[PDB]
Design a protein around this ligand. Structure first.
Ligand SMILES: *[C@@H]1O[C@H](CO)[C@@H](O[C@@H]2O[C@H](CO)[C@@H](O)[C@H](O)[C@H]2NC(C)=O)[C@H](O)[C@H]1NC(C)=O
Ligand SMILES: *[C@@H]1O[C@H](CO)[C@@H](O[C@@H]2O[C@H](CO)[C@@H](O)[C@H](O)[C@H]2NC(C)=O)[C@H](O)[C@H]1NC(C)=O
Ligand SMILES: *[C@@H]1O[C@H](CO)[C@@H](O[C@@H]2O[C@H](CO)[C@@H](O)[C@H](O)[C@H]2NC(C)=O)[C@H](O)[C@H]1NC(C)=O
Ligand SMILES: *[C@@H]1O[C@H](CO)[C@@H](O[C@@H]2O[C@H](CO)[C@@H](O)[C@H](O)[C@H]2NC(C)=O)[C@H](O)[C@H]1NC(C)=O
Ligand SMILES: CCCCCCCC/C=C\CCCCCCCC(=O)O
Ligand SMILES: CCCCCCCC/C=C\CCCCCCCC(=O)O
Ligand SMILES: CCCCCCCCCCCCCCCC(=O)O
Ligand SMILES: CCCCCCCCCCCCCCCC(=O)O
Ligand SMILES: *[C@@H]1O[C@H](CO)[C@@H](O)[C@H](O)[C@H]1NC(C)=O
Ligand SMILES: *[C@@H]1O[C@H](CO)[C@@H](O)[C@H](O)[C@H]1NC(C)=O
Ligand SMILES: *[C@@H]1O[C@H](CO)[C@@H](O)[C@H](O)[C@H]1NC(C)=O
Ligand SMILES: *[C@@H]1O[C@H](CO)[C@@H](O)[C@H](O)[C@H]1NC(C)=O
Ligand SMILES: *[C@@H]1O[C@H](CO)[C@@H](O)[C@H](O)[C@H]1NC(C)=O
Ligand SMILES: *[C@@H]1O[C@H](CO)[C@@H](O)[C@H](O)[C@H]1NC(C)=O
Ligand SMILES: *[C@@H]1O[C@H](CO)[C@@H](O)[C@H](O)[C@H]1NC(C)=O
Lengths: 96, 49, 300, 193
């Protein structure tokens, strides 16, 4: 098991929200510690999982969408929101 | 009479099948396995699950 | 120190836990029950647990004179706390018998209250290279005043570098003494003799509290107990009625919040004279476990 | 439990843990969070009803002073023959590296080692009014007396004129609904209930 490749996310300019970036990982290890040491988390919200369980367990695949985004527009990314962000830019999937 | 003998044997088997199958009901939890609930959630969510 | 003389096969009377008499059972707090039977989950001893026995003795005594003390190595037995414990105090203080030392002198067996040191951290005694030194805030439980006072304090203990005094190069142990003849004259009970003999060994530095409690002494059965939780340290005692002395009730909480890991029973030798001495009883320590018990309550 | 029910009711005991804490690190105190705060500094216990409060303390109120930095622990482990062995917090307890961490920290990522144990600290300056966290927990039903807030206190009443009717009651902090009847003494009277 060679290690996962996060260097696309860690170098360059992050994209806009309508043109978001996607990464998918299978069959690798990734060092969650020192990923958390590059960013300062302002908020999280999880659905049928918790972040302390992602740190201590294994899963078949990991999928990350990422974009630049102002934190003070956080409530426009909530499920059930009514504005332009969910309608025309990004809508979160809740199957997994 | 032969159908009644087989009916009795099947009622005995049906009680045990229906017992064993209810251990795979999730009842609206994320799993019917307790081990997967303990591995995927934190303590506060674990209790309500 | 000659610990093969004290824990020998002389007395060694085994005393298991009898649940049919409800020995060592802590009563529920905030509530009572009457004439019923129910299950209760708590901290209890195991049935038929023999526990551990502690035999005490008056020290070496010259004719008419007082010498160095005859103790065990209880000050070097560091035991694991794990849930707290209960102590059966002097059940043999109603019959004849010696303590352990004067094998041909039966004297009427008094009761001996145990003394404890309890701590989170433990280490070496520097330069004596002896284990069993408590090094941060330690909790001290001391009986005093011919068994009428309980001192409890939480302090840093600094060893003193006198003649041995628990902090020299040569180091036997910490050991405490008392005098039934001069310190225990009736009318004037000197309730600081154990405190002063303890202060010979240690400097008490940065004491966060100093509590004093009234102890009820007699020659019947006695039970003491200690537990810790997130609200602090709890102390339990049998009451004073000669009416169901197996029941232990909560009488003190202490604001100690770091986890207690180690404890030490303090070796004693009460320095009675040679001719008119008093023989000493044992005490028994039993460990608590998280258990479910079926309890029966009478109408009282 | 809700905070407005702590304001109108009585409980057996109250427990408050408190420390200095930046509000913009609030999500590291969440249950389920994954960083260094829950692992090495504080893990909340959930066996009793409990609340978590973050607050700012203003300028001229109180006599609370400010420290120079905020500070948390980033690592706590022991070395072995195989390698590092990370020591994690238990719920409600203190870190096993607490005696090492009492030596203070002067720079970010400063270490302190004693024997097997090692700890690393992280400091950063305090800017503006001080901020604080409070972990509160209550207990019900474990005591013959209560802790009550002063707005929940009423004077006193008697039962001797209202026997055998349904009434509300508040007896030493135990509240409910019932019918009372003069009886013969049973149970231990020092336990009151
Ligand atoms: C994940 O990455 C971190 C880098 O932040 C690794 O931590 C380093 O480990 C080496 C050797 O163990 C040290 O020399 C560095 O000083 C460490 N850096 C920090 C910031 O602590 C960590 O070892 C990696 N995890 C694993 C499992 O390999
Ligand atoms: C808890 O006790 C320890 C003793 O084991 C204290 O640490 C010692 O502090 C002195 C200060 O002069 C040092 O010389 C020793 O080397 C320290 N011991 C160790 C093992 O490092 C510690 O200070 C106490 N805790 C607090 C909060 O004061
Ligand atoms: C419990 O008893 C002890 C001993 O009588 C008291 O200890 C004294 O405390 C005062 C003030 O705290 C000190 O000035 C003395 O030096 C202490 N004397 C000794 C011999 O230790 C203690 O105060 C008592 N506890 C309370 C709450 O009053
Ligand atoms: C709780 O404490 C506050 C202190 O702020 C009390 O309020 C004060 O009461 C006195 C007496 O009437 C007034 O002179 C002050 O002006 C009050 N201060 C404020 C800020 O209102 C309050 O009475 C106490 N609560 C209870 C129930 O006694
Ligand atoms: C900003 C609210 C001002 C309008 C309030 C009065 C109109 C109420 C009618 C519909 C309100 C529905 C809009 C919900 C606002 C939340 C925005 C969001 O979902 O992010
Ligand atoms: C903050 C950087 C996000 C990086 C996404 C790629 C890594 C995905 C793997 C695990 C994500 C789990 C981290 C959960 C974040 C919450 C941190 C917390 O407050 O505990
Ligand atoms: C891969 C780098 C090249 C792409 C450059 C894209 C620059 C991103 C700027 C757009 C940000 C979109 C987020 C706006 C929403 C918000 O902040 O509320
Ligand atoms: C007892 C008072 C003296 C000790 C001074 C300690 C106060 C400064 C340390 C603040 C640490 C609080 C937690 C740091 C993480 C954060 O700020 O979010
Ligand atoms: C005294 O110490 C020795 C070894 O340190 C130990 O074997 C013995 O059990 C101790 N004495 C008692 C009475 O426990
Ligand atoms: C102990 O002995 C005394 C007198 O010898 C006696 O009165 C008392 O009842 C005895 N204790 C018990 C529990 O019987
Ligand atoms: C004396 O104590 C030191 C610890 O400071 C230890 O390393 C050494 O081995 C001890 N000496 C003996 C003879 O045990
Ligand atoms: C006692 O408290 C003082 C605080 O004024 C502290 O400086 C000192 O180190 C403490 N004593 C010990 C032995 O740590
Ligand atoms: C405290 O500061 C506020 C402004 O933030 C001011 O209005 C108030 O008068 C001050 N009170 C005191 C006692 O300084
Ligand atoms: C794990 O395996 C490695 C590889 O040999 C070894 O060096 C290490 O000591 C092992 N650790 C444990 C705890 O077994
Ligand atoms: C209640 O009963 C007690 C004892 O049975 C009695 O002393 C008392 O007078 C009674 N009170 C009333 C109001 O009847």
């Amino acid at each position: 098991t060679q290690e996962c490749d996060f260097t696309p996310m860690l170098t360059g300019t992050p994209p806009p929200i309508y043109n978001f970036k996607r990464l998918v990982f299978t069959n690798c290890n990734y060092n969650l510690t020192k990923l958390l040491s590059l960013f300062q988390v302002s908020e999280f919200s999880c659905h049928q999982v918790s972040p302390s369980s992602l740190a201590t367990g294994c899963y078949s695949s990991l999928t990350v969408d990422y974009f630049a985004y102002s934190t003070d527009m956080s409530s426009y990314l909530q499920p059930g929101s009514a504005g332009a962000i969910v309608q025309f830019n990004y809508k979160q999937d809740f199957s997994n | 009479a032969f159908n009644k003998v087989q009916d009795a044997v099947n009622a005995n088997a049906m009680a045990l099948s229906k017992l064993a199958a209810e251990l795979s009901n999730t009842f609206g939890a994320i799993s019917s396995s307790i081990s997967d609930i303990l591995a995927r959630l934190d303590t506060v969510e674990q209790e309500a699950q | 120190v000659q610990p093969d003389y004290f824990e020998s096969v002389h007395t060694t009377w085994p005393m298991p836990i009898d649940t049919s008499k409800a020995e060592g059972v802590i009563y529920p707090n905030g509530k009572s029950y009457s004439n019923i039977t129910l299950t209760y989950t708590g901290l209890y001893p195991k049935a038929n647990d023999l526990g551990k026995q502690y035999l005490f003795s008056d020290g070496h005594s010259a004719p008419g004179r007082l010498n160095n003390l005859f103790v065990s190595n209880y000050s070097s037995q560091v035991e694991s706390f794990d849930d707290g414990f209960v102590v059966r105090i002097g059940a043999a203080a109603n019959k004849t018998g010696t303590t352990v030392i004067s094998q041909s002198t039966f004297k009427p067996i008094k009761k001996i209250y145990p003394a404890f040191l309890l701590g989170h951290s433990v280490g070496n005694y520097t330069p004596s290279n002896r284990t069993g030194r408590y090094l941060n805030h330690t909790l001290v439980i001391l009986p005093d005043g011919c068994g009428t006072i309980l001192h409890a304090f939480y302090c840093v203990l600094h060893p003193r570098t006198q003649q041995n005094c628990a902090g020299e190069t040569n180091f036997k142990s910490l050991s405490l003494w008392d005098t039934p003849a001069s310190d225990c004259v009736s009318g004037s009970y000197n309730q600081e003799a154990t405190l002063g003999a303890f202060k010979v060994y240690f400097d008490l530095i940065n004491c966060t509290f100093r509590y004093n409690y009234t102890i009820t002494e007699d020659e019947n059965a006695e039970w003491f107990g200690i537990t810790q939780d997130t609200q602090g340290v709890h102390l339990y005692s049998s009451r004073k009625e000669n009416v169901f002395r197996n029941n232990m009730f909560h009488f003190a909480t202490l604001p100690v919040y770091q986890k207690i890991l180690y404890y030490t029973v303090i070796p004693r030798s009460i320095r009675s004279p040679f001719n008119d001495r008093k023989a000493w009883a044992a005490f028994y320590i039993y460990k608590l476990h998280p258990l479910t018990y079926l309890l029966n309550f009478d109408v009282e | 439990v809700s905070p407005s029910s702590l304001a109108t009711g009585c409980y057996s005991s109250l427990t408050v843990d408190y420390f200095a804490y930046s509000t913009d690190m609030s999500s590291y105190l969440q249950p389920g969070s994954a960083g260094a705060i829950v692992q090495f500094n504080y893990k909340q216990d959930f066996s009793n009803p409990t609340c978590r409060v973050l607050a700012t303390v203003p300028q001229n109120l109180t006599t609370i002073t400010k420290p120079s930095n905020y500070a948390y622990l980033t690592e706590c482990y022991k070395t072995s023959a195989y390698g590092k062995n990370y020591l994690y917090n238990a719920p409600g307890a203190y870190t096993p590296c607490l005696s090492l961490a009492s030596r203070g920290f002067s720079t970010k990522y400063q270490s302190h080692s004693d024997g097997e144990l090692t700890t690393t600290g992280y400091i950063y300056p305090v800017t503006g009014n001080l901020q604080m966290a409070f972990i509160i927990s209550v207990q019900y039903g474990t005591d013959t007396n209560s802790v009550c807030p002063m707005q929940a206190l009423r004077n006193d009443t008697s039962i001797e004129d209202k026997l055998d009717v349904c009434v509300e009651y508040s007896l030493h902090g135990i509240t409910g609904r019932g019918v009372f009847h003069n009886c013969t003494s049973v149970g231990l009277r020092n336990q009151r209930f």
